[PDB]
């Protein structure tokens, strides 16, 4: 199909990969740091989602350098993915409006 849809699909799949890789890598980075809570995989996956969506409740977060770098990648991938879907939606509406005119 068209580019904007392919990119949206690709961005979504990629986002899911980053959430999975990020959850695993966050636990690896945080264990060994006294006080870290982002240390078991199930809640790390939850953490990765609320990070990618930019909600950031504060129930979980990284305290180490690498856990934070992993977090930054998760944030940017999430913002970029949703931004790209918005961009695809705009392309869709714009194309249609041209049609409604000619």
């Amino acid at each position, epitope marked *: 199909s068209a580019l904007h849809w392919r990119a949206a699909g690709a961005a979504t799949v990629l986002l899911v990969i980053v959430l999975l890789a990020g959850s695993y890598l966050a636990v690896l980075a945080e*264990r*060994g740091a006294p*006080g*870290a809570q982002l240390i*078991t*995989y199930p809640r790390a996956l939850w953490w990765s989602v609320e990070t990618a969506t930019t909600v950031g409740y504060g129930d979980l977060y990284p305290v180490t350098l690498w856990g934070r770098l992993v977090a930054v990648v998760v944030m940017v991938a999430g913002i970029t993915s949703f931004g790209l879907v918005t961009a695809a939606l705009a392309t869709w509406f714009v194309g249609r409006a041209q049609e409604r005119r000619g």
Partner: antibody
Amino acid sequence: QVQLQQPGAELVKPGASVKLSCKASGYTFTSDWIHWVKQRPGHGLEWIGEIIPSYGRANYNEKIQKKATLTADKSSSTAFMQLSSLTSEDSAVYYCARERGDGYFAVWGAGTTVTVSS
Amino acid sequence: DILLTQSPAILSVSPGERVSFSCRASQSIGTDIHWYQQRTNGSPRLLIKYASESISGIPSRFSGSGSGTDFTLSINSVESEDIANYYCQQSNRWPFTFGSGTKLEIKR
């Protein structure tokens, strides 16, 4: 079948070192962590450290004099704990346990009785 | 690091009576507490995970409760095989820590 295999015992002369093993069978995931716990006679369970075989990173109890060094051999599904320069304080049963990255020790090894004596 | 307190260290109960072991965390750990049983010369055995979740193979008699800083492991109608040491363990913060243990004694 026995998920975690540990030798029954190890005799070590004071000052020397010994390498304990923990052979795992059963389901194995890249996300499994192998933990080591020390228990002196008549006392409780003391957490020593952990290692993730798929990556090889290890963490240790910082609160106690560091006597251990953890390694893992992926091909033989065996985890190792190197204890060096031991004293009578190091004599105890050392258990290895498997954690699926979800916080609890689902299964434990039989433990290796380590004795420091001349 | 989280200090897990188990008091009393020894509990004497009569047969068939309900018993409760206490485990207190130095700070709130949600429900990230797990219980293990260790009989004489035996290895530890998982009884309850995340405060109250059942483990297959463990008798219905065992149950757990609590959240925050205070947790309880209970046994409905104690019998001889329950004589052992009981430990709590937390996985809320790194590093994982163990309670000091409680011994179960039966007065026959």
